Write a protein that binds this DNA or RNA. Structure first.
Length: 147
RNA sequence: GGAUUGAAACGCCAUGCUCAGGCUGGCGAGUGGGCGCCACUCUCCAA
């Protein structure tokens, strides 16, 4: 509920529980070396970002999406980007999906603006038609169309 | 003729859009109007 949705109670990104996944005679996490404090750091950061109290998380389809910058109010409006369609690093975007007890990365972007017009823009421009009344609204919501 | 974090790795097994329902009841192409007014087969040729 308060973490990655649909995954096991405790999940991990790195794990080598089965022999088929080992190589060169290594074993366990030693199969990929990382300093202990470094491992702690990013895990804590990821846990923090997952906290619902901080408005930097959103669920789309099956994948949970997390983003961060020095400010987040505009990107947070992507909530309507699907719910009701219309110095610091800027807008890292990460989307991951859950396996049974381990996580996988779906996509990864670092672009600015946050534009998704590639599909939405095409989607809307395909729907263009002159209206009948003068008081109609240009951008109908999917709910209205389906109804 | 050692070693491309490599060498091997099926999305797979299978399931009815079914059972049934009147385009009906009914309505005037109907009322009425002149093909009329008038005009030379007529001049001459043995059997």
């Amino acid at each position: 509920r308060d973490g990655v949705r649909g995954a096991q109670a405790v999940a991990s990104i790195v794990s080598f529980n089965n022999t088929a996944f080992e190589s060169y005679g290594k074993e366990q996490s030693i199969n990929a070396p990382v300093s202990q404090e470094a491992a702690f750091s990013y895990v804590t950061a990821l846990n923090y970002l997952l906290n619902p109290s901080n408005r930097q998380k959103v669920t789309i389809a099956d994948a949970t999406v997390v983003f961060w910058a020095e400010r987040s109010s505009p990107a947070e409006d992507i909530f309507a980007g699907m719910f009701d369609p219309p110095e610091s690093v800027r807008f890292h975007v990460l989307g991951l999906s859950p396996n049974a007890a381990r996580l996988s990365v779906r996509f990864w972007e670092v672009d600015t603006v946050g534009h998704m017009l590639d599909k939405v823009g095409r989607h809307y421009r395909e729907l263009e038609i002159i209206p009948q009344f003068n008081n109609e609204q240009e951008f109908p919501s999917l709910s209205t169309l389906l109804r």
